[PDB]
Scaffold this active site. Structure first.
Site, mmCIF file in Angstrom:
data_model
loop_
_atom_site.group_PDB
_atom_site.id
_atom_site.type_symbol
_atom_site.label_atom_id
_atom_site.label_comp_id
_atom_site.label_asym_id
_atom_site.label_seq_id
_atom_site.Cartn_x
_atom_site.Cartn_y
_atom_site.Cartn_z
ATOM 1 N N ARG A 1 -41.792 -17.054 4.851
ATOM 2 C CA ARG A 1 -41.596 -17.708 3.564
ATOM 3 C C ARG A 1 -40.283 -18.483 3.534
ATOM 4 N NH1 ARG A 1 -44.721 -15.436 -0.225
ATOM 5 N NH2 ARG A 1 -46.016 -13.627 0.331
ATOM 6 N N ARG B 1 -35.658 -16.613 2.883
ATOM 7 C CA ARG B 1 -35.032 -15.340 3.224
ATOM 8 C C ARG B 1 -34.553 -15.291 4.672
ATOM 9 N NH1 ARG B 1 -37.416 -13.671 6.989
ATOM 10 N NH2 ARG B 1 -35.728 -12.122 7.110
#
Length: 110
Positions: free
Chosen positions: A87, A35
């Site tokens: 992440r 992301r």
């Protein structure tokens, strides 16, 4: 001339859809969450805070806009891995147009 190392990455599939938080992409057969998508620059002469979070519709683009619109694929990495939550490091391309999500109005809806 400084040669910039550009990694020719391939596109992924649809596994998870979220407003820039955690999206798993099928890489080498295995899913990976990435992301990294933030851009703010208006067309006005003086760039002052571009477009903001228009809506969560983005998560829907992964359905139709993913199969009909320039869908998510990986290109290059930044080299940080963790930006917000931590992440993976990759930008989610929706209908060939970055949804652009940052800040809320002015200060978390004042």
């Amino acid at each position: 001339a400084t040669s910039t190392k550009k990694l020719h990455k391939e596109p992924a599939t649809l596994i998870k859809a979220i407003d820039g938080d955690t999206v798993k992409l099928m890489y080498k057969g295995q899913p990976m969450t990435f992301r990294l998508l933030l851009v703010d620059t208006p067309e006005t002469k003086h760039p002052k805070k571009g477009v903001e979070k228009y809506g969560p519709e983005a998560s829907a683009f992964t359905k139709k806009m993913w199969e009909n619109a320039k869908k998510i694929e990986v290109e290059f990495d930044k080299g940080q891995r963790t930006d917000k939550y931590g992440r993976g490091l990759a930008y989610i391309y929706a209908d060939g147009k970055m949804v652009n999500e940052a800040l809320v109005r002015q200060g978390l809806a004042k």
